[PDB]
Amino acid sequence: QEEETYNIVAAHGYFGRLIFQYASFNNSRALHFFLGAWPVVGIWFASLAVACFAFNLNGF
Amino acid sequence: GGEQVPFLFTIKGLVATSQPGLTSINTSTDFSGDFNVPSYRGSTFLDPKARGLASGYDNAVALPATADEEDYVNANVKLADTKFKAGHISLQVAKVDGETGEIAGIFESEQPSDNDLGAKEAVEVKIRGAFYAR
Amino acid sequence: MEVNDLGFVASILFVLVPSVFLLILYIQTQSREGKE
Amino acid sequence: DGIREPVSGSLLYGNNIITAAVVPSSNAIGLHFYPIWEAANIDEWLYNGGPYQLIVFHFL
Amino acid sequence: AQRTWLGDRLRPLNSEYGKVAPGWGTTPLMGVFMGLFFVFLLIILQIYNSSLILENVSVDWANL
Amino acid sequence: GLPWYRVHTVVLNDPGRLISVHLMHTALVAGWAGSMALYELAVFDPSDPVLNPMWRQGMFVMPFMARLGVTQSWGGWSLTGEVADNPGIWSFEGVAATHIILSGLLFLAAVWHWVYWDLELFTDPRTGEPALDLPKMFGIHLFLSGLLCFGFGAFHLTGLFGPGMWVSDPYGLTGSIQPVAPSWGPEGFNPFNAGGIAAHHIAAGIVGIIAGLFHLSVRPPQRLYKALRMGNIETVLSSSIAAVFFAAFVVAGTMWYGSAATPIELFGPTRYQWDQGYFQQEIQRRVQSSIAQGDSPSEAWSKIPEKLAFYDYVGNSPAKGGLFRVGPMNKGDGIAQGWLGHPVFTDAEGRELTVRRLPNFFETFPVILTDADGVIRADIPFRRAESRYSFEQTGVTVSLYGGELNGKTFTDPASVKKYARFAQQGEPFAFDRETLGSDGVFRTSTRGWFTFGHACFALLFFFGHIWHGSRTIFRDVFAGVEADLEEQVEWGNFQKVGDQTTRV
Amino acid sequence: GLPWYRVHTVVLNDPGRLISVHLMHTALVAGWAGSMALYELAVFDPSDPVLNPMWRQGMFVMPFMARLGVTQSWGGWSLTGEVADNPGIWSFEGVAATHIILSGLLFLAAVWHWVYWDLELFTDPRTGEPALDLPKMFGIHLFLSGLLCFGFGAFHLTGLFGPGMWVSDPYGLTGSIQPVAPSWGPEGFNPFNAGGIAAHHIAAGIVGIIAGLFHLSVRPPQRLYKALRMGNIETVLSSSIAAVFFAAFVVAGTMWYGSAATPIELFGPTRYQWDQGYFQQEIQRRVQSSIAQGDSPSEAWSKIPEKLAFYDYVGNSPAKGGLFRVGPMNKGDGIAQGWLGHPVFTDAEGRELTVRRLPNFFETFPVILTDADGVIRADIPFRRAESRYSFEQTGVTVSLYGGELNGKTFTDPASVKKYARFAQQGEPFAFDRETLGSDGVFRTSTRGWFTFGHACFALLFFFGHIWHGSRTIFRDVFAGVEADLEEQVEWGNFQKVGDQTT
Amino acid sequence: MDRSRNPNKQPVELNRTSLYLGLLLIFVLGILFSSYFF
Ligand code: CLA
Ligand code: CLA
Ligand code: CLA
Ligand code: CLA
Ligand code: CLA
Ligand code: CLA
Ligand SMILES: CC(C)=CCC/C(C)=C/CC/C(C)=C\CC/C(C)=C/CC/C(C)=C/CC/C(C)=C\CC/C(C)=C\CC/C(C)=C/CC/C(C)=C/CC1=CC(=O)C(C)=C(C)C1=O
Ligand SMILES: CC1=C(/C=C/C(C)=C/C=C/C(C)=C/C=C/C=C(C)/C=C/C=C(C)/C=C/C2=C(C)CCCC2(C)C)C(C)(C)CCC1
Ligand SMILES: CC1=C(/C=C/C(C)=C/C=C/C(C)=C/C=C/C=C(C)/C=C/C=C(C)/C=C/C2=C(C)CCCC2(C)C)C(C)(C)CCC1
Ligand SMILES: CC1=C(\C=C/C(C)=C/C=C/C(C)=C/C=C/C=C(C)/C=C/C=C(C)/C=C/C2=C(C)CCCC2(C)C)C(C)(C)CCC1
């Protein structure tokens, strides 16, 4: 359907009233990028951890 | 054919080789035959997967703490055996002076710190020797 | 006391899997009766 | 059998539902009315043919 | 009705559905061939019962 | 709707998914034969084919793939014992491996016809209702089966492009695979000659060819087409299970009595080896060939193999075993260890005497010991008040000749009671009733379980033949009768019964 | 309709069958307690209560009926060893039997309210909709529970019309049934004194009486009735589950640490008997009391009972046992046969030395042998290349004092390795690992399985308390929110959030 | 090559009282044959 199942304007100021009002995510397309950023940029550090472990460059 | 994996050991530990009656030298005909002594599989450190050896290494049990000293496979003793083996000669060149020819080795099998009794294996191949002298 | 070691597998599938076959087929009729 | 030999017919004593029984009353009582109260104890009742006559005169 | 490449090679095989020979058909040609089968099965039943025992048969072991 | 026992009648009208409803059934049986034989290979013990052979391990399906020319099983062990092995694709797994993927490729084709129906093939051109011609199709089903038997007769059993079936000697010792010659005479009609089974499917296949070559060309008569109701799809369903339970009676028979298509090395002895003592006619023959030949008893009873002694045991005869004593024959005895010879019983006087007892339909035969003509000389006294033929007053000795425990006599009468019951079961055998948890009471072989499961099922397929044979003739009346019909049933309907075209 | 997880919401409106839907649940739990304890009586082995006691047989429910005064088992084998006569009606076969027939009489009453609803009791007179008063009914539920605790305090635990609870000595030897006196002081607040548990339900019952006598007479305030949403059935359910979780934490606690309501003879030692060596403080005390009398240790270590030696075993401590090593403790060891004494280790010089090792959260402790102050004198060498403290170079002997195998020394160092590992598990014990098919690795007692199954379930009942506590406060919004509400959520708009008057 | 909708598949009508006959029949075969599986 073309209409949304939920309102982003009520979900904004809930989380704006839970934490800082300035530190919520007002627009959903900036929200979903950070949803798609944080494990994705995270795990190829851990994948690059074992890949830099591979040449015996280890943890301290 | 029979789905075991016996660990064969081609050992040459102290052959003391007798020989038939009076030879000038080998004539690509004479028969060398005796035995060596064979070694083991567990050379005093080969643990099984519950760390079960004699020579150090956690006597006779780890995890069943109350059925502990009842099992039977923890006597892990080494041996200094003697058997039969034969080795022939067939080619025996003159200038580089290397002599070769067949062999027939009959050994004992593995005793994996003394579980099983040994099997018997007739291993037969060419010797590939090389001789020089004073 | 001796036992066959596998009858309790055998006589728990002998009783259930035709009865839950039969218990499947009664519920469907009830829905049909409802007309839903 | 009326001598000594306590023949088992109950499912707790190792016997199947084909082999189980109420295992009827003793030969030593004969045709005596042997209720639960003319027994000196219920262990004397159940060893000597007690619960067969309870499921005969009640059943008939 | 879904015409496939399979269906264009077997529609002449299943073309006729009830097409049936009149007159009498082949029932006397069926009966003279299959009364011999019942007496063929009468041979096989008592070869194996050993009741029409010929020579060099010996329905038994010592066979090959 | 419909009741639960008439569920499959949705497929009775349209033959679009009727191909699909066999094809998951065909995937279920092909996905049984691989799925069982791969389990059947998980418990084999190939270390001793002479002492516990493959029918001793309760093994239903690995004679049936084995008795056509397959042996190798990627383990260095072959039933034949023929060496220089290198299986490749046709080992035991490789037939059992293939039936998995075939049933997978059967199941993927089984789901195809369920979603796709009316593929321009199932309807007549006269109107669009789904209806298929059965007698023209019988000429093209059987012509393929006529080709395939003629392939199975000449091109598989005779060495032309294939290995032969299993064939042994009588008193089965050296049973291996070799291509058998099709013997065409009357000698191929006794089922113990394997030359008939090669001459079978050539001769039955060539008349299977000349049936289906004829059956495509002609049409059935209308005095049969309205009589046998040949347009109906259930009229193939009756009178094909008539040809299945007729066909299931013969392999209930020819497995049980025995044939060349049911040899001893992969089915066991066949229960009539005690009613004449068939194997006991041989080991007794060879020692008297060796006896007078120039060899004493003790030294003789040793060129007998233990395979001949293993077929002279009650515990390999397939009569014993019950319906619910479940499992292999090795749960009955354990693993056969050694022969320990043949008992010979002597008294204080000689007077040699023997035990030849325990027939098959007993369970507990009382031990008797008798002489050559039949007068009893010893028994086991059940009541020792008035004994006159007991072991102890007679003083019977045991000579145990040959085998593992050769030359060991027994003069103590407490130990003679053990070997007397062992002499009841032909020749004794050493066992180990602790490695498999074997209890001690008898089981039956794969020859026993086949004929139970192919004659009880053949009884059940007779009832479906009456039931489907009713519903084909009586299709119109099947949802009840027309209301009154009182003039058809009352006496005086000229003259033939049930006639409307008459005086009535 | 409804999804599968909201099936029971049909009963949420009408309370006609809500009595019936507890009553088959009440028949299912009462028809478990008889149905389990009758199975639990089928495997007991009453031939030796001192060597394999009743918690050794993996027996969950027959401490709990047993620890209130019932020991007559019908076979004449009294639990306490003093079964004087025919017990009478109240033996385990009896109490177990009743719970069958009671659950049958619960189930026949459970089917009655399902077919019969609207029995003029579930509706208000103001309109005909089914609705029941909860706070007036809480005053009549709790007044019955206030009567029943005051019955349980004085009229059952104190000998007035009933036998007392189980009470033992410390270092549990002569634990039997006698009526305990309700001690009212501060001494009844430590849970090891059983005089508080009799003084419990008198004092909690009398304030349970004065609660429900008060709670019938008054009404809740409207600043609470709209706040706690007390007209709703769900809110009460949420409160009850939350309260229950709190009640399941304490018997997760007081079973595990131990109390007078959890004695040793029907629950085992309580896992803190190795972290201080509680039982090893006693058998060591009594032999040094015996040599203070002046006895030799060969014919001392014999007035110790084997019951004190059985509590000084690793294999009765409830720490060991795993999650999926399933079955009784007798599948771990077999049947306890005999003590075979206490090992005393001497070297070639004396230099006495001991083994006091294997704490609870290990599995394979390496065997060390040490002196009085802590310097190691012997061990088991894992690598015999550079050994300097091995058994063979030191030449350790074993003095096995008391018990079954008293006076039998061992000077061969192949056999000292067996008794050194036996000395790790306190005192050794003879077994038979063939009669029950016992494998040889440890299991845990009924004290171990209770606190696993009452703290994991109490975690799960915390989530239902959040879930039912949400749905009571948030009943109106539960099928989604009203559509826009953008003026309520945008800031600065007057004044305080959720106010419509700015 | 293209799907359609079946003009077929009548549903099933197992009654309430016919459930009781089938549930009892399996349970007498349960109490008959369970001894023989042991
Ligand atoms: C070649 C075999 C064969 C085939 C294809 C059919 C086909 C049919 N039979 Mg039929 N039948 C057969 C053999 C066969 N029969 C035999 C051997 C008997 C005698 C026992 C019967 C007795 C019989 C009766 C009495 C009736 C039918 C009916 C029917 C029709 C519907 C079946 C249905 O919905 O049941 C669906 C079945 C079930 C939902 C479950 C039944 C429970 C069974 C026992 C489970 C089977 C166990 C196991 C899974 C199978 C393994 C055994 C197998 C290896 C043989 C269908 C045309 C019905 C009819 O008239 O319709 C036209 C009917 O009333 N059959
Ligand atoms: C006809 C086919 C056939 C044959 C002869 C056998 C025979 C055998 N199988 Mg086998 N099997 C079969 C089919 C067959 N199986 C099928 C289809 C499967 C897959 C489920 C298996 C799976 C299987 C396994 C997994 C194993 C065997 C094993 C064995 C052997 C041990 C004996 C035994 O279990 O008998 C036991 C027979 C019975 C107890 C008789 C059952 C009688 C039924 C229950 C009667 C049913 C009555 C019915 C409920 C009433 C109708 C109701 C009424 C209202 C109409 C024996 C050689 C064992 C073996 O040796 O393998 C190493 C083994 O481990 N089988
Ligand atoms: C109680 C037994 C019985 C009954 C009631 C039926 C009933 C029926 N069968 Mg049937 N049938 C049976 C047994 C039976 N069959 C047996 C044992 C077989 C062999 C497997 C068959 C094979 C069979 C086929 C192939 C067909 C039928 C058909 C039919 C139906 C039509 C009637 C017909 O033509 O009969 C058939 C008549 C007989 C079976 C009688 C045979 C009597 C023979 C000729 C006498 C031989 C005597 C001989 C001298 C002695 C030799 C034996 C000796 C060594 C002992 C009807 C439902 C037809 C059908 O399905 O309908 C569409 C059909 O096509 N039947
Ligand atoms: C005092 C206990 C108690 C009671 C009476 C209820 C009552 C209710 N809960 Mg609830 N709940 C509870 C505890 C309780 N809850 C706990 C402890 C949790 C946390 C795990 C939850 C989590 C929960 C959720 C998440 C939801 C409910 C819902 C519901 C309602 C409908 C239930 C339904 O249809 O499920 C029917 C259940 C099934 C058809 C099968 C579920 C499969 C389970 C796992 C099988 C249970 C195993 C075994 C049989 C039980 C033994 C364990 C037992 C001894 C504890 C109902 C008012 C639903 C709701 O909001 O409706 C208003 C809902 O969505 N509950
Ligand atoms: C909390 C109650 C309680 C307590 C503590 C115990 C404890 C015990 N029982 Mg017992 N039992 C109970 C309830 C309980 N039972 C119930 C309700 C029944 C009836 C079904 C039984 C029936 C029973 C029998 C028949 C026997 C015992 C026995 C035993 C003892 C052996 C140890 C054992 O089996 O643990 C084993 C424990 C486990 C293997 C843990 C199970 C963990 C489950 C499967 C986790 C579930 C996770 C779940 C599927 C995931 C959720 C999905 C997710 C998406 C949400 C032990 C003392 C035995 C004994 O000694 O008696 C003589 C015995 O024979 N019990
Ligand atoms: C994460 C924990 C958590 C959360 C989110 C909730 C949420 C809720 N509870 Mg709840 N509850 C909890 C834990 C929690 N509970 C615990 C642990 C208990 C004890 C078993 C309860 C007992 C309880 C009851 C009895 C009731 C609720 C109710 C409610 C609901 C209304 C809000 C309310 O009054 O809160 C209650 C407030 C608290 C639980 C906060 C307690 C904080 C205390 C007062 C501070 C004490 C600090 C102290 C100095 C330190 C002592 C401890 C020290 C020894 C370490 C709401 C759904 C009510 C309800 O069901 O709604 C209708 C209701 O009647 N709760
Ligand atoms: C003594 C008494 C009585 C005192 C009371 C009276 C009194 C005097 C009070 C004054 C005291 C007072 C006010 C405060 C003192 C206490 C104090 C300083 C407490 C602070 C403690 C502390 C460390 C707080 C910080 C921790 C905290 C709350 C948050 C951490 C924030 C952080 C770094 C990261 C959070 C992660 C993050 C950015 C999440 C957002 C990302 C995300 C995926 C959002 C999802 C999301 C966002 C949307 O935007 C919308 C739209 C939708 C759809 C949506 O999915
Ligand atoms: C997808 C696919 C696949 C797969 C396949 C598979 C895997 C299959 C399976 C198959 C199978 C898995 C088969 C099997 C089956 C089985 C069966 C089918 C059985 C049955 C049974 C029965 C029938 C029985 C009966 C009975 C009983 C119950 C008991 C006894 C008696 C009687 C007989 C009655 C592959 C990848 C390859 C390829 C692609 C496709
Ligand atoms: C009718 C009647 C009767 C009867 C009754 C009865 C008989 C009842 C029964 C009862 C019963 C019979 C009871 C029991 C029950 C049981 C139960 C109820 C169980 C349950 C279980 C559970 C719940 C479990 C769960 C689980 C699992 C699964 C495993 C482990 C874990 C858990 C826990 C999770 C009488 C005659 C008397 C009288 C009249 C009436
Ligand atoms: C294809 C398809 C189809 C059909 C489907 C169906 C419906 C199927 C069925 C299927 C079936 C119907 C299957 C069955 C199978 C069988 C089984 C699954 C069984 C198994 C069993 C067993 C194995 C048993 C038992 C046992 C045990 C386990 C233990 C004891 C021993 C014995 C062996 C007895 C259609 C076309 C529609 C379409 C879609 C797809």
User: Phi/psi at F345 (nearest 5 deg)?
Assistant: -100, 125
Cβ separation A9–G489 shorter than 8 A: yes
Question: How far is it, in rounded angstroms, from Cα H9 to Cα F7?
Answer: 9
Which sign, positive or negative, has the C-alpha torsion F417, F421, F423, F427? Answer: negative
**G289, two tokens:** 């009391």
User: Phi/psi at H15 (nearest 5 deg)?
Assistant: -75, 175
Query: Which residues in chain A are closer than 8 Å to G481, comparing Cβ atoms?
Result: 7, 10
Which sign, positive or negative, has the C-alpha torsion F328, F333, F339, F341? Answer: negative
For chain B, say whether G421 makes contact (Cβ under 8 Å): yes
Q: Which of F258, F315, F312 is nearest to F284 (CA)?
A: F312
Question: How far is it, in rounded angstroms, from Cα C3 to Cα G462?
Answer: 44
| Residue nearest (by alpha carbon) to ligand 9 atom 10 | G31
Residue in B63, B66, B67 nearest the CB of G364: B63
Is the separation of the CB atoms in G407 and G400 below 8 Å? yes
Question: How far is it, in rounded angstroms, from Cα F54 to Cα F62?
Answer: 8
Query: Which residues in chain C are closer than 8 Å to F1, comparing Cβ atoms?
Result: 32
Q: Which of G489, G482, G404 is nearest to G51 (CA)?
A: G404
Question: How far is it, in rounded angstroms, from Cα G392 to Cα G390?
Answer: 6
- Chain D neighbors (3+ CB pairs < 8 Å): H
Expressed in angstroms and rounded, the spacing between residue A60 Cα and the centre of ligand 5 is: 46
The set of residues, in sequence order, having a beta carbon less than 8 Å from that of G442 and lying 6+ positions away, is: B65, B66, G314, G315, G320, G321, G322, G325, G332, G333
Cis peptide bond N-terminal to F351, omega within 30: yes
Which amino acid does the sequence have at F179?
P
Q: Which of residues 1-38 of H touch F (CB under 8 A)?
A: 1, 3-4, 6, 8-14, 36-37
User: Cα-Cα-Cα-Cα dihedral of G372, G378, G383, G386, to 10°?
Assistant: 100
Note the Cα H36 to chain centre separation in Å: 24
Is it the case that chain A and chain B have 3 or more CB pairs lying under 8 Å apart? no
Question: What one-character DSSP code corresponds to residue G354?
Answer: B
Q: Which of F73, G67, G321 is nearest to B66 (CA)?
A: G321
Q: Are strands B120-123 and B126-128 parallel, antiparallel or unpaired?
A: unpaired
| Residue nearest (by alpha carbon) to ligand 4 atom 37 | G5
* Interface with chain C: mutation pick from H28, H33, H37, highest number of C CBs within 10 Å: H37
Cβ separation D17–H34 shorter than 8 A: yes
Question: How far is it, in rounded angstroms, from Cα F175 to Cα F151?
Answer: 25
Expressed in angstroms and rounded, the spacing between residue G36 Cα and the centre of ligand 9 is: 8
Residue in E1, E14, E47 nearest the CB of F132: E14
Cβ separation F4–H14 shorter than 8 A: yes
Is the separation of the CB atoms in F323 and F377 below 8 Å? no
Q: Which of G90, G109, G136, G128 is nearest to G25 (CA)?
A: G109
Render F126-184 in DSSP notation, one character per residue. SSSSB---SHHHHHHHHHHHHHHHHHHHHHHHSSTTS---EE--SSSSS-EE-PPP---
Cβ separation H14–C22 shorter than 8 A: yes
Residue of F nearest to H33 (CA): F324
User: Phi/psi at G81 (nearest 5 deg)?
Assistant: 85, 5
Element (H, E) at G469: helix G446-473
**F52, two tokens:** 């516990």
User: Cα-Cα-Cα-Cα dihedral of G364, G370, G375, G379, to 10°?
Assistant: -50
Question: How far is it, in rounded angstroms, from Cα E21 to Cα G425?
Answer: 97
- Tell me the structure's resolution in angstroms, rounded to a single decimal: 3.5
Expressed in angstroms and rounded, the spacing between residue F465 Cα and the centre of ligand 3 is: 10
Taking each helix axis from N to C end, the angle separating F242-256 and F446-473, rounded to the nearest 10 degrees, works out to 160
Element (H, E) at B100: strand B100-108
Is the separation of the CB atoms in G98 and G485 below 8 Å? no
Is the separation of the CB atoms in G65 and G268 below 8 Å? no
Is the separation of the CB atoms in G393 and G413 below 8 Å? no
Residue with tokens 């949304």: A4
**G97, two tokens:** 């039997």
Question: What one-character DSSP code corresponds to residue E13?
Answer: T
Cβ neighbour number for residue H2 with a 10 Å cutoff: 5
Residues lining ligand 4, judged by CB closer than 6 Å? G 4-9, 237, 241, 460-461, 463-464, 467, 471
The set of residues, in sequence order, having a beta carbon less than 8 Å from that of F481 and lying 6+ positions away, is: none
- Chain E neighbors (3+ CB pairs < 8 Å): F, H
Angle formed at CA B60 by CA B56 and CA B64, multiple of 5 degrees: 130
Is the separation of the CB atoms in F422 and F428 below 8 Å? yes
Expressed in angstroms and rounded, the spacing between residue D23 Cα and the centre of ligand 1 is: 43
For chain E, say whether F140 makes contact (Cβ under 8 Å): yes
Question: How far is it, in rounded angstroms, from Cα F398 to Cα F409?
Answer: 6
For chain F, say whether B5 makes contact (Cβ under 8 Å): no
Taking each helix axis from N to C end, the angle separating G446-473 and G233-256, rounded to the nearest 10 degrees, works out to 160
Question: How far is it, in rounded angstroms, from Cα F126 to Cα F455?
Answer: 45
- Chain G neighbors (3+ CB pairs < 8 Å): A, B
The whole-angstrom distance between H7's CA and the closest CA on chain D is 51
Expressed in angstroms and rounded, the spacing between residue F99 Cα and the centre of ligand 8 is: 11
Is the separation of the CB atoms in B61 and B71 below 8 Å? yes
Q: Which of residues 148-207 of G touch B (CB under 8 A)?
A: none
Q: Which ligand minimizes its atom distance to the CA of F461? A: 1
Is the separation of the CB atoms in G68 and G95 below 8 Å? no
Query: Which residues in chain H are closer than 8 Å to F116, comparing Cβ atoms?
Result: 1, 3
Is it the case that chain B and chain C have 3 or more CB pairs lying under 8 Å apart? no
For chain H, say whether F174 makes contact (Cβ under 8 Å): no
Q: Are strands F166-167 and F368-370 parallel, antiparallel or unpaired?
A: unpaired
Question: How far is it, in rounded angstroms, from Cα G225 to Cα G220?
Answer: 7
Angle formed at CA E61 by CA E59 and CA E63, multiple of 5 degrees: 90
Does ligand 5 lie within 6 Å of residue G322's CB atom?
no
* Interface with chain F: mutation pick from H12, H14, H23, highest number of F CBs within 10 Å: H12
User: Phi/psi at G233 (nearest 5 deg)?
Assistant: -70, -40
Q: Which of G167, G397, G399, G160 is nearest to G301 (CA)?
A: G399
Is the separation of the CB atoms in G98 and G79 below 8 Å? no
Q: Are strands G376-379 and G368-370 parallel, antiparallel or unpaired?
A: antiparallel
Question: How far is it, in rounded angstroms, from Cα E18 to Cα E21?
Answer: 10
Angle formed at CA A56 by CA A54 and CA A60, multiple of 5 degrees: 120
**G439, two tokens:** 């494998």
Element (H, E) at B103: strand B100-108
Residue of F nearest to B1 (CA): F76
The whole-angstrom distance between H2's CA and the closest CA on chain E is 8
Helices (H), E1-64: 7-10, 27-47
Burial B87-111 (b: 16+ CB within 10 A, else e): bbbeebeeeeeebbbebebebbbbb
Is the separation of the CB atoms in H30 and C14 below 8 Å? yes
